Amino acid sequence: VRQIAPGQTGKIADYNYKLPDDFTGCVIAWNSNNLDSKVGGNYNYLYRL
């Protein structure tokens, strides 16, 4: 979540969602473990690698 920001480098920040260097706007983040996670593991989410 720290890596969704302008000028960041890495796996997801460059292969999934790259923000512009002069990006204007806001980044929203909040905890979702108690709703997005289920017993046995949740496999409904995919990311490019």
Partner: peptide
């Protein structure tokens, strides 16, 4: 793509292109 600064006043130059 990268758009010219003339067409965008406040926003970022880069626009959705996927």
């Amino acid at each position: 793509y990268r758009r010219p600064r003339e067409q965008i006043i406040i926003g970022s130059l880069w626009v959705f292109c996927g």
